[PDB]
RNA sequence: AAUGCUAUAGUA
């Protein structure tokens, strides 16, 4: 997505060299794609573009009658929120084929919010919503949410995304050192010394 | 004011 972003991230490439340098165009690149399906899916579904705000402040916005200061809540930081009917809904966007990597998540995040709900008594659930990026499909992982919104239709394809991880997966498939720290997340630990 | 991975005689 963009040009000027394009350029940039392509000017990146051509002057990357090193195993860590790699790695962090490749996180990157990752994020990138997130932001652009985080925006798309915002625009969509009519709710405000928020990226990872933090908890507490999601309690003041829905409820600003309480002490923040006396209120104990997860350090999460949650993608958006939306609060309707008495009830707040926390989203996360996640971009894989993988329900596992997501389920993960959704028990992360209700066994820290069930706190939070019972010191509220705001029932707060928990909804993922996860595409393919190879077939664009929509899953999501909270019926009430899918309720919310009869129909889910969002027109994204992340083939500029797709080519240029080839390309810098083609000018470092030989660094097996690449290879290792791609497997594993932002933590990068070099080859072991013995 | 500032923001680029290699930024590389003295003290105990």
């Known amino acids: 997505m963009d040009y000027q972003e394009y350029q940039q991230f392509l ?7 090193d195993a860590c340098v790699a790695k962090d165009i490749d996180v990157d690149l990752l994020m990138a794609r997130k932001d652009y399906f985080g925006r798309e899916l915002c625009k969509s ?8 705000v933090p908890f507490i402040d999601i309690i003041l916005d829905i409820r600003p009658e309480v002490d923040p200061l006396t209120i104990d809540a997860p350090h999460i930081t949650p993608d958006n929120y939306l609060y309707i009917n008495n ?5 996360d966007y996640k971009v894989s084929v993988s329900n ?5 998540t959704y028990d992360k995040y ?8 019972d010191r509220l008594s705001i029932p707060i659930e928990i909804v993922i919503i996860r595409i393919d990026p190879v077939s664009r499909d929509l899953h999501i992982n909270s019926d009430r949410f899918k309720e919310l919104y009869p129909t ?5 394809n992340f083939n500029q995304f797709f080519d240029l991880k080839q390309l810098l997966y083609e000018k470092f498939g030989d660094d097996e050192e690449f290879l290792l720290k791609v497997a594993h997340g932002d933590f990068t630990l070099t080859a072991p010394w013995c």
């Open 45 to 52: 579904l009519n709710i405000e573009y928020r990226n990872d």
């Open 87 to 91: 009830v707040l809904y926390i989203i």
């Open 110 to 117: 209700y066994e820290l919010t069930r706190d939070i709900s």
């Open 100 to 104: 596992e990597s997501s389920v993960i």
């Open 11 to 17: 000017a990146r490439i051509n002057t990357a060299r």
């Open 152 to 156: 889910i239709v969002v027109d994204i």
